[PDB]
RNA sequence: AACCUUACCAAAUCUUGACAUCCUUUGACAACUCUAGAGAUAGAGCCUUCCGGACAAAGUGACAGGUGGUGCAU
RNA sequence: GUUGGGCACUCUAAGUUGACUGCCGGUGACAAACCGGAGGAAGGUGGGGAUGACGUCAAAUCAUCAUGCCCCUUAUGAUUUGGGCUACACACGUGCUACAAUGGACAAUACAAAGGGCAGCGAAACCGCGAGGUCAAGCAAAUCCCAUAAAGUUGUUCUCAGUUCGGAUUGUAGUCUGCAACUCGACUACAUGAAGCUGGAAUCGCUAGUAAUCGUAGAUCAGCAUGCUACGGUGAAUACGUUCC
């Protein structure tokens, strides 16, 4: 475990920390530049000290909770006033103004006819 | 302007709206200008927007303002 | 409506060891033009074949095609009859690096290069996919033998 | 002294010079296996010595340009056996036997209207 | 189907009848050249020219016409070329000055018989008999070549005919030929006929 | 080096016309003066233009033309007052377009 | 409606990127070569003529 | 195809008109700025100021104008 | 190659030579032609393009254009703002990205063509993680610019998993253009990480520098290209034969 969820033993460091929700591949090398380990690790072999610092940078970094609720709401508040992007939502349609005649089978879900 | 030029607003429904700063806010003002940003200065007015045929009314608040008018008035009815 | 035979092409052999198979088997495996990738890993699998038997790549090679490289082969004509004929041998060739190379792909393993000297290996000890697509081409020729 | 020859090879030009020393080509002041990847190339460049048996008794001297590294290569040996024949017109019956001397004609195709290529068409449907 | 011979020519054995080069300035030129083209709405009817070769250079256009009748568009005097200049200046604004050249056996050239026989059938004659005499007055001339052709609403009739009719040799195939085209339109109370003519005169390379 | 020089651009779109005033220039400036530099020709870069033969439909059908700016470039090398004015009382035809550099 | 449409486009307008161009003996609006300010078939038509300077076919 | 394009739609508007030819009155034309309006447009300061010949406007009737139909009239 | 020096070589583009069954052998009704060979850079219309016969589809276009007839002329005409042509329960066509190890990421390094450029291409330097921004040089061209081509090659690392493949979708902060990017621009950075593990019946392109793959430029274009047109780099396999569609 790291911020509250587990990651990986056999994938590295810069692999493993982007098995949170929050963190990508750059907030991972940045954070362990800034908590300094190699990249070349593997957490099965970190230590505590290591472990810790990595702890201490990634409290930082909002994720893994806030990150979603910052998500959920915005889009609540979005679809509380009636907006366009919203009205979107509401219905299970794209949002950045794609074409829904054809091609839109992620927010569509698959073909019903 | 989605850029460092800052926001964008019509001129004269900036001047409508300082007009209507008495805040008595009998009247709701007319407009096709659904282009416009939206302040912090039109909360609690009521705006009537120019989808394509009708001059649809819309509620300002405090959640509408890094947006547009035109986020409220849809141009397209479909059922 | 067309006209006879068109002249075949030619190809140099390699350096590494001289023989037209392995250019012939570069322009098989190449995808997309990357000649270079062929190269490697046909060296690589010629390295690795020197490894576990432990003989030359050249004698071991040619004896994995002289196993997985017909002597028959059928067609169809007319309802339609499928007919054996003798193959030709530069299509025996032809039809043996094909195999070679497809069930190497096909072998489902790590990596090319170990897929290849496997099949390779194989077909020299009588065994693998190619053969079994060997073995399968003269058993429907010899059923249909009746109709040469 | 010197044997000049030009090359040719898709759109490649390579002005060669042999001047009397071992076998070692430099390109651009660049060792011609650094400079190209491929053994197969360097075998295709020295093919003209192989055939007519002068392979240890020349350098070699490159300026170089267009197109990429097997045209260039190709080229290499045309310029090669183009200035050999300044060196020793008896080598020409070899050369032209073995199909050194020619300047391959081929060189890319033009993009045809309504094609996406020199030959492929769309695909097709009748529907 | 089959194209301009005149536009397969170009460069080959004809020269453009636009002798200037521009870059900057090009499309604007071109337009002025184009209103030139366009003025001889108040002679083309009468004067029966051919074509028309503007050449610019050093603030000036030497442009040149083809006619038939050089004497309807001279004058009595020189005079009427005068008043071109001076109809034309208005419109052109540059040191505009213009250049007359005949051209004789005036039925040997395309566009002035295709003209002619349009003139002809807005009077209502018979379009048979029209390219019938065409082609014997021109191969009589001597040519070496002609064809004719005829489409529209032909007889004052409800559907369409195209007809052609030629005698010699006129190979539109071949670029040695130096083949001379032209059309024409004839405004008929039925609607819109078109005539075409391709004259052969004989072979001579200029370069 | 460096020296004093007239240098000239002729640019049409056919040969014959660039060709047949620059060997007349070429003789003007060496009865004048002497010492030319022969024309230099340059690449001679042409535009292509494509376009459909159809008005309304059939884009697979297409249409090419071309201009080809075909450039030519002498520097006449002895400079004097003769050749200059011998050179510019001379600008013509209408198909080619010089330019000087003094 | 094309000499109303043709009409403002010669006219200058309010605001600079609203401008625009239409072929000048037509009034074609697509497909038009801003070096010629003509569109492709009245390009062709003139080309044929050989009232353009330097154009004709390629290849 | 953001506007324009653009024709389609809603609304606000115009009816010799957005464009052309002719006649009468005059006139050298704009542009710049202000108010109201969504702006097109109207109210203004406003000069635009004569280069037979020119410019624009204003009045008027011929006249315009139509990406409306017919490609089975051309 | 920067200057000195030269136009050798390359390259550029004008004039020319050359491919003509022209020569030889053989076959054949000596003919016509065919097979093979020498020479030559190329040999049998050298490769490719442009060139599309009398005519057929009463094919398409009256919305490039013109045009007979008909129809509207306080309207079937014209101005402006705003919207729509970008909708979506679905079906089809044509292309792009992928499904991974002939591969992903990362550091170093290499070889092109062809084209465009004036209120337009915007070098270098600096700032910014990047899209870019400030100052600003050259450049109306073989001179300066777009512009470091990529695939590659050599190294490290990943280890056959819905993954370090994939990169949709969505949210945030932004840039550039524009009179204004919600309707409805592109691009960027961060975070998330969809179906998808090689595709049913069927079906398509291609015979050589071709398919396949890799990037590059232009037209239109204030801004927008997975398309269109052009460009070159690497570079196949197969075509026995006309039995059958
Ligand atoms: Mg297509
Ligand atoms: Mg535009
Ligand atoms: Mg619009
Ligand atoms: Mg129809
Ligand atoms: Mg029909
Ligand atoms: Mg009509
Ligand atoms: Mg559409
Ligand atoms: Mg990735
Ligand atoms: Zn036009």
Not at chain 6, 62 to 87: C, G, M, S, Y
């Amino acid at each position: 475990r790291i911020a509250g969820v587990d990651i990986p033993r056999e994938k590295r460091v810069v692999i493993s920390l982007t098995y949170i929700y929050g963190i990508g591949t750059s907030t991972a090398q940045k954070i362990l530049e800034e908590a300094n380990v190699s990249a070349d690790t593997r957490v099965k072999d970190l230590t505590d000290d290591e472990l810790g610092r990595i702890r201490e940078v990634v409290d930082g970094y909002k994720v893994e909770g806030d990150l979603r609720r910052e998500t959920n709401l915005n889009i609540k508040r979005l679809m509380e006033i009636s907006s366009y992007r919203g009205i979107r939502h509401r219905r299970g349609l794209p949002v950045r103004g794609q074409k829904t005649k054809n091609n839109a089978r992620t927010r569509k879900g698959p073909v019903k006819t | 302007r989605s850029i460092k030029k800052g926001p964008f607003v019509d001129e004269h429904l900036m001047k409508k709206v300082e007009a209507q700063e008495g805040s008595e806010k009998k009247q709701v003002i007319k407009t096709w200008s659904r282009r416009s940003t939206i302040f912090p200065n039109f909360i609690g007015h009521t705006f009537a927007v120019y989808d394509g045929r009708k001059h649809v009314p819309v509620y300002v608040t405090e959640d509408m303002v890094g947006h547009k008018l035109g986020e409220f008035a849809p141009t397209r009815t479909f059922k | 409506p067309r006209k006879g035979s068109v002249p075949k092409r030619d190809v140099l052999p390699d350096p590494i060891h001289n023989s037209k198979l392995v250019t012939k088997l570069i322009n098989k495996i190449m995808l997309d033009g990357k000649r270079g990738t062929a190269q490697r890993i046909l060296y690589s699998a010629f390295d690795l074949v020197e490894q576990r038997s432990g003989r030359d790549a050249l004698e071991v090679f040619e004896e994995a095609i002289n196993n997985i490289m017909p002597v028959l082969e059928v067609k169809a004509r007319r309802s339609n009859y499928q007919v054996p004929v003798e193959v030709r041998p530069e299509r025996r060739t032809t039809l043996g690096l094909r195999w070679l190379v497809n069930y190497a792909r096909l072998r489902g393993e790590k990596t090319m290069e170990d897929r290849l000297a496997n099949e390779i290996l194989d077909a020299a000890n009588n065994t693998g996919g190619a053969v079994k697509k060997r073995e399968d081409t003269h058993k429907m020729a010899e059923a249909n033998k009746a109709f040469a | 002294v010197e044997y000049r020859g030009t090359g040719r090879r898709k759109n490649s030009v390579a002005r060669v010079r042999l001047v009397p020393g071992e076998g070692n080509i430099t390109v651009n002041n660049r060792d011609v296996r650094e400079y190209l990847p491929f053994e197969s190339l360097i075998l295709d460049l020295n093919q003209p010595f192989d055939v007519t048996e002068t392979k240890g008794n020349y350098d070699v001297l490159v300026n170089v340009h267009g197109g990429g590294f097997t045209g260039q290569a190709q080229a290499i040996r045309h310029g090669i056996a183009r200035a050999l024949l300044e060196a020793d017109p008896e080598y020409r019956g070899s050369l032209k036997r073995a199909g050194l001397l020619t300047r391959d004609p081929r060189m890319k195709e033009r993009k045809k209207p309504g094609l996406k290529a020199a030959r492929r068409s769309p695909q097709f449907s009748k529907r | 189907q089959k194209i301009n011979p005149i536009g397969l020519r170009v460069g080959i054995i004809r020269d453009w009848e636009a002798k200037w080069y521009a870059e900057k300035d090009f499309a604007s030129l071109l337009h002025e050249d184009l209103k030139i083209r366009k003025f001889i709405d108040n002679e083309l009817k009468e004067a029966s020219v051919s074509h028309v070769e503007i050449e610019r250079a050093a603030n000036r256009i030497n442009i040149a016409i083809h006619t038939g009748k050089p004497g309807m568009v001279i004058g009595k005097g020189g005079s009427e070329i005068e008043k071109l200049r001076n109809k034309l200046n208005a419109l052109t604004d540059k040191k505009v000055h213009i250049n007359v050249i005949e051209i004789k056996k005036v039925d040997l050239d395309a566009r002035l018989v295709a003209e002619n026989i349009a003139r002809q059938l807005e009077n209502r004659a018979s379009f048979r008999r029209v390219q019938k005499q065409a082609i014997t007055r021109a191969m009589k001339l001597g040519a070496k070549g002609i064809k004719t052709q005829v489409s529209g609403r032909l007889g004052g009739a409800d559907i369409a005919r195209a007809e052609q009719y030629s005698e010699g040799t006129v190979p539109l195939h071949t670029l040695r030929a130096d083949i001379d085209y032209a059309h024409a339109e004839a405004d008929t109370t039925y609607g819109k006929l078109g005539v075409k003519v391709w004259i052969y005169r004989g072979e001579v390379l200029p370069t | 080096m460096a020296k004093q020089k007239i240098r000239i651009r002729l640019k049409a779109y056919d040969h014959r016309v660039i060709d047949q005033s620059a060997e007349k220039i070429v003789e003007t400036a060496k009865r004048s003066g002497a010492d030319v530099s022969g024309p230099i020709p340059l690449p001679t870069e042409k535009s292509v233009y494509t376009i459909i033969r159809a008005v309304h439909k059939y884009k697979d059908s297409r249409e090419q033309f071309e201009q080809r700016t075909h450039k030519r470039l002498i520097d006449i090398v002895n400079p004097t007052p003769k050749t200059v004015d011998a050179l510019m009382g001379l600008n013509l035809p209408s198909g080619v377009d010089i330019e000087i550099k003094l | 409606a094309k000499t109303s449409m043709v009409a403002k486009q010669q006219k200058k307008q309010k605001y600079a990127v609203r401008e625009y161009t239409r072929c000048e003996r037509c009034g074609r609006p697509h497909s038009v070569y801003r070096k010629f300010k003509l569109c492709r078939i009245c390009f062709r038509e003139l080309a044929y003529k050989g009232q353009i300077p330097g154009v004709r076919k390629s290849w």
